[PDB]
Design a protein around this nucleic acid. Structure first.
Lengths: 117, 56, 103, 110, 150, 142
RNA sequence: CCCGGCGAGGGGAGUGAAAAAGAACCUGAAACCGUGUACGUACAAGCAGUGGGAGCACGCUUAGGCGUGUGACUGCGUACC
RNA sequence: GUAACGGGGCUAAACCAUGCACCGAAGCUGCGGCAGCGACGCUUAUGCGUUGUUGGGUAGGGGAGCGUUCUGUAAGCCUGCGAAGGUGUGCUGUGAGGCAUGCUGGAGGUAUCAGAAGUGCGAAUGCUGACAUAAGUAACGAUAAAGCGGGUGAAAAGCCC
């Protein structure tokens, strides 16, 4: 039983070239190049899924600080405050109120400032 | 000396960024015969500034 | 006029009428969950959980279709070590609409 | 009405024919014919002959009225190569490809 | 493969790659790494497993009442049409009809009948026992398949 | 519901005026730079330039600490032959002082294209007035 | 029948179920070369992706702050055997 | 080429000492999910609310599967109201894949359960073919040498006079 080979093969190469669209020059044209190109894209996105979560928190923190510092408190103390603030728990992401409700924020600083007094 | 990596189909492109021919623009028509003709040149039937020169 | 609440393992700022995607949630497709520990509410003048959770603030929403997110690929590949595996994973989620925000 | 004419197996590379072809593209068929007559590349004649045949095709087989015609479309694709050898120094034999094109001209009035 | 022992080109020097026989399985025309020979695929099968198998399949024919024994199944002359008749009559189309001593006409009939096949008792094989919708079998023959299987 | 992004086309900006006079360069640069980068608001978007335009003033009078005034490094290379020129701090305050503060906060903004833009917002000046009255610069400090 | 060198090639006509069978003729992949359109690109430095992400373009549903393409700017990042 | 703080810059943004915040990892926690190996409670041709726990990995051992050709099942089933193949898309699978369907194509393809293997390729300076690169670059083969008039011709430096 001599076996054709080829359709099942063209299936694969196409499967990879398809995942490699928009990649530059041979990255998106030539299987042998295309492959190693997909695999790293894969490895980058497994890394970067983990990364993303770091990136945002640092985005958040940065802007919490801008705001805290604008109401005359450092991020560090502000957090400490919130932490002591009769418990009082509340994502750093969530503290986007920072951008979209400057009055609800100063509220927070006050609550915080207080639990620190 | 020979290349170490194959040049991209793009570099060819860029190298050729200057290969374009230039079209003429600068031809005119003889006041006396039909005859378009390059400026400062004899027209085929043999005219130049009206006045049929070169009898051939 | 919004409020905040813990529900994924994550928190969410939310206003009535507004839909949010939460992690999965047994609650059958059409019924009504009631988030009864909101960590803040606000109009023009607002209520922070002096402790966690504002005294009597609750939030109501109706589940509204369950689902599975778009597949994602897990690639592991150790160069020169004759090693690699690829993997597919999806992720259940339930979606709620938000009718509540009972101050 | 489109109406077109083409030269397949043209004995010129393509790269070279294109050089001429880009002079002409989208020109008034009239102004096209002039740019061609006064272009000294052997491709020029190759492509003038197509333009001409194509215009003729227009006037005879369709609406015609060559007064409105434009070379609305011109592009030249590469034909098959004839393959040869070049006896060379020290017994080495070298490849060499005689290349050919397919010229296509499309002329219309819109 | 028809060719020569000659080594296509030197070992070292031409910038090419070893090479040694124009017949390399890896070379184009000519090769085949483990070329087949004609082979015998017969398998053994213990006796007691062959007999054991048959028993196992009769029993199941019977349990699906696909086994329909009759006294004397036979026909009057070698005419497929005739047989085809009896079959229509008995509500049969896919059948075995394994008879005792085999007559000849019933073999001659049935031949062109494609969904049907007749055998003598001592003939009877595993698959054809399974292959048909029903298998008939005469008292004449059961006594025989009896002895046979013991 | 993703976190917010400043958006280059809606971002505010604002003008200010800072007197460098007695200020200790570098504790000044540090501020210019952070404000220069928008790091004080909805920065919260590091791909977008949210900084404020700050115009500096009296750079020549900027202040230094230790012996730096006579001793502060200041090297650079023309990428020629063996072309490594150097100039002392006082040498630089001497010819085009503006430079010290510039080269200063530059080293503090980030990297490439973006950060490079951020720096154009900063208009220094060796002297004591400037010609950007129309921008209605508001004064500030550090 | 027409362009052309009583060419090469081509446009019609016509045959044919079909010339999306015209002789280099079933199907007709891939590398590789073009024409056309969206988007990007002439102060920008590195395995060229990946994470975040404006803008433009096109589809959305009567908006709903979505899909597809593109991808300024930005964190991370030295191919495979 | 500054080049012996990573840089800017720092007189503290350095050292020492005490203290309290904070940031910080694919560690730990939270929510959702899958599997391997155990064993409760509900209850056995048992999987479960489940439940404790484990889940980096070359060489190597073990386990479970995809798909390809060909035999049977198949004188069945699908198919000119469009097979195989080619090219899109959609949904699905942990994956190898599957299924649907637009386009192309225009005569063959086969579920299922089993059976057999010329069963899976990126690398062997692998074999064949096709096609890129360098590049419209080198070169056009003795530095004995050409000029013009007429001619034929679609075109003549190169043929003819």
């Amino acid at each position: 039983a001599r076996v054709k080979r080829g359709v099942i093969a063209r299936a694969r190469h196409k499967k990879i070239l398809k995942q490699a669209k928009g990649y530059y020059g041979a990255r998106s044209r030539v299987y042998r190049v295309a492959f190693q190109a997909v695999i790293k894209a894969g490895q980058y996105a497994y890394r970067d899924r983990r990364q993303r979560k770091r990136q945002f928190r640092q985005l958040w923190i940065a802007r919490i600080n801008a705001a805290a510092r604008q109401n005359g408190i450092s991020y560090s103390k502000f957090i400490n405050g919130l932490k002591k603030a009769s418990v009082e728990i509340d994502r750093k992401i969530l503290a986007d109120i920072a951008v979209f409700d400057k009055v609800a924020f100063t509220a927070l600083v006050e609550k915080a400032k207080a639990a620190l007094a | 000396a020979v290349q170490q990596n194959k040049p991209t189909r793009s570099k060819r492109g860029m190298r050729r960024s200057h290969d374009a021919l230039t079209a003429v623009t600068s031809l005119s028509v003889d006041k006396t015969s039909g005859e378009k003709h390059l400026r400062h040149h004899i027209t085929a039937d043999g005219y130049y500034r009206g006045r049929k020169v070169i009898a051939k | 006029m919004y409020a905040v609440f813990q529900s994924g393992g994550k928190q969410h700022r939310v206003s009535e009428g507004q839909t949010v995607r939460l992690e999965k949630l047994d609650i059958a497709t059409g019924e009504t969950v009631e988030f009864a520990e909101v960590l803040m509410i606000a109009n023009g003048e607002e209520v922070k959980i002096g402790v966690p959770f504002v005294d009597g603030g609750v939030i109501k929403a109706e589940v509204v279709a369950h689902g599975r997110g778009e597949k994602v690929k897990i690639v592991k590949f150790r160069r020169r070590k004759h090693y690699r595996k690829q993997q597919g994973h999806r992720q259940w989620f339930t979606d709620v609409k938000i009718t509540g925000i009972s101050a | 009405m489109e109406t077109i004419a083409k030269h397949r197996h043209a004995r010129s590379s393509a790269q070279k024919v294109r050089l001429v072809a880009d002079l002409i593209r989208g020109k008034k068929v009239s102004q096209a014919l002039d740019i061609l007559t006064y272009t000294n590349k052997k491709a020029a004649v190759l492509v003038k002959k197509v333009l001409e045949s194509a215009i003729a095709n227009a006037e005879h087989n369709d609406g015609a009225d060559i007064d409105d015609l434009k070379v609305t479309k011109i592009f030249v694709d590469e034909g098959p190569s004839m393959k040869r050898i070049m006896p060379r120094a020290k017994g080495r034999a070298d490849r060499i490809l005689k290349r050919t094109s397919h010229i296509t001209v499309v002329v219309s009035d819109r | 493969v028809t060719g020569s022992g000659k080594k296509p080109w030197r070992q070292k020097g031409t910038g090419r790659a070893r090479s040694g026989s124009i017949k390399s399985p890896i070379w184009r025309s000519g090769g085949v790494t483990f070329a087949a020979r004609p082979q015998d695929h017969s398998q053994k099968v213990n006796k007691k497993m062959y007999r054991g198998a048959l028993k196992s399949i009769l029993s199941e024919l019977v349990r699906q009442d696909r086994l329909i024994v009759v006294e004397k199944f036979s026909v009057e002359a070698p005419k497929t049409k005739l047989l085809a008749q009896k079959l229509k009559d008995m509500a049969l189309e896919d059948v075995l009809i394994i008879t005792g001593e085999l007559d000849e006409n019933l073999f001659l009939a049935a031949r062109n009948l494609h969904k049907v096949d007749v055998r003598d008792a001592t003939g009877i094989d595993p698959v054809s026992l399974i292959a048909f919708d029903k298998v008939v079998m005469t008292a004449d023959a059961v006594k025989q398949v009896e002895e046979m299987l013991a | 519901m993703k976190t917010f992004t400043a958006k280059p086309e809606t971002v505010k900006r604002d003008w200010y005026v800072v007197d460098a006079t007695g200020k200790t360069l570098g504790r000044l640069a540090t501020e210019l730079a952070r404000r220069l980068r928008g790091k004080h608001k909805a920065e919260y978007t590091p791909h977008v330039d949210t900084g404020d335009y700050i115009i500096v003033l009296n750079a020549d009078k900027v202040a230094v600490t230790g012996n730096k005034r006579t001793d502060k490094v200041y090297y650079h290379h023309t990428g020629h032959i063996g072309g490594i020129k150097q100039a002392t701090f006082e040498e630089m305050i001497a010819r085009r002082p503006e430079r010290v503060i510039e080269i200063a906060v530059k080293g503090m903004l980030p990297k490439g294209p973006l950060g490079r833009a951020m720096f154009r917002k900063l208009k220094v000046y060796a002297g004591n007035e400037h010609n950007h009255a129309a921008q209605q610069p508001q004064v500030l400090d550090i």
